């Protein structure tokens, strides 16, 4: 049939021989995915676009007849798409084209883990042509779904931010302003998304943890991606985590703002940001540095100012370490 | 009705912003309780998400370690195809580029 051998009887001796020698269209091809990674050619990114569009349509219409058993190969095929994009590192032009087509129709949890990783790999468009088409629906479901979908979007858009900032770093390498306005507006719209998601869930610490995880990648724009895009907190998150009630979110904010100090200082070296951004960061400083308290009170109850520090610091407060040293 | 609704929208946002600015933070009637009822509720909810966020940030570095291995392997296979393609560019330079038509007929 298919290399079903009959030398198994000889494979007593032939297994001894093995021991004797011991002693005496392209997604499911990782070795070929490197080719398409390297050719941004026209008839191959189109030979491949048309397959992805007609596989994400036919096999997604397959949902409308099973939705339960077809929901495991589609998940495992979208996983291969996701992996191929994480390797090849540019969003497949059918991945967005399927997303704009299937985001309005989308529910909260139908392949959420796969759909909200597809959003990460969306060819930076303008954030004026992609916002109404997609982000007006990643707010239509963001504000109507639970925290467990909410955290899965600011994480999804967190990875989207990196996958846009990579492609902007080499846009500095391969020789802006109107591209600048796109990531800045994405971050503000998330910063708009993430002040009203803060309000829907009564300042849930889980959701704001993911919010800061997004902002953990907004402090380091200049240092990491060579992009001069230091965008500070909107206060609806800054003080909402400043006056929060746990330190794994408090030290998170502290790490973000310390990287903000570092990034603003680095931007002052090379050079609106200066006037209003420095004003807002000194606002977030004087208000907070005077404020640096409830979760710290939890530690103090569990607990000579320098010794209190040492009790802190020693017990995992590393964002506080990076601030206090600064 | 689009315009007739935009006008009432601006009229309603005006009222809501004039009423929010009227809203001074009303902490005077805050709570007669000693707030232990609200406190040990808020720390207990903190206990409800802290286990629920450690369980997520443990999967975070799980997937970050798995992806560090995966993208290290991708970078290795990328530098390999980078040095290989560079040496192919250098070799195909002035090796097959020095191809004459009459020499191609002589090889035939």
């Amino acid at each position: 049939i298919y290399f079903k051998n009959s030398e198994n009887l000889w494979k007593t001796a032939l297994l001894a021989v093995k021991q004797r020698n011991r002693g005496p269209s392209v997604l499911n091809n990782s070795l070929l995915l490197h080719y398409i990674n390297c050719v941004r050619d026209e008839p191959v990114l189109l030979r491949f676009y048309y397959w992805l569009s007609q596989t994400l349509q036919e096999e997604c219409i397959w949902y409308k007849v099973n939705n339960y058993e077809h929901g495991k190969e589609f998940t495992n095929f979208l996983d291969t798409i996701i992996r191929a994009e994480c390797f090849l590192q540019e969003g497949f032009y059918s991945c967005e084209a399927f997303l704009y087509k299937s985001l309005p129709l989308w529910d909260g949890l139908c392949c959420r883990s796969q759909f909200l990783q597809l959003v990460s790999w969306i060819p930076f468009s303008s954030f004026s042509e992609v916002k109404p088409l997609l982000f007006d629906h990643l707010a239509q479901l963001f504000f109507t779904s639970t925290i467990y979908f909410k955290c899965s979007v600011l994480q999804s858009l967190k990875e989207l931010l990196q996958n846009w900032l990579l492609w902007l770093s080499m846009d500095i390498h391969m020789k802006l302003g109107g591209s600048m306005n796109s990531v800045s507006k994405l971050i503000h719209y998330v910063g708009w998304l993430s002040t009203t998601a803060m309000r829907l869930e009564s300042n849930n610490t889980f959701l704001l943890h993911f919010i800061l995880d997004f902002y953990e990648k907004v402090c380091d724009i200049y240092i990491n991606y060579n992009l001069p895009l230091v965008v500070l907190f909107p206060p609806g998150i800054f003080y909402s985590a400043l006056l929060s009630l746990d330190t794994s979110i408090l030290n998170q904010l502290c790490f973000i703002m310390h990287r903000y100090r570092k990034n603003l200082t680095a931007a002052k070296k090379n050079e609106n940001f200066s006037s209003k951004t420095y004003q807002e960061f000194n606002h977030y400083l004087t208000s907070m540095v005077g404020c640096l308290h409830p979760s710290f009170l939890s530690y103090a109850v569990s607990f000579k100012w320098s010794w209190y520090l040492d009790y802190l610091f020693s017990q995992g407060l590393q964002g506080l370490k990076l601030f206090i040293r600064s | 009705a689009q315009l007739s609704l935009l006008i009432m929208q601006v009229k309603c946002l005006t009222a809501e912003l004039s009423q929010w600015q009227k809203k001074t933070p009303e902490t005077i009637p805050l709570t007669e309780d000693v707030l232990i009822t609200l406190g040990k509720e808020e720390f207990q909810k903190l206990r409800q998400d802290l286990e629920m966020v450690l369980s997520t940030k443990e999967s975070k570095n799980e997937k970050l370690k798995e992806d560090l291995e995966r993208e290290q392997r991708w970078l290795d296979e990328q530098q390999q195809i980078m040095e290989s393609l560079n040496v192919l560019h250098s070799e195909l330079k002035n090796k097959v580029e020095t191809f004459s038509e009459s020499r191609i007929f002589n090889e035939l």
């Binding site: 883990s113 467990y148 | 997937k63």
Partner: peptide, 12 residues
């Protein structure tokens, strides 16, 4: 990932 995980705290 934390998306595949966030789909199993929605259930659990």
């Amino acid at each position: 990932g934390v998306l595949a995980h966030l789909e199993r705290l929605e259930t659990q």
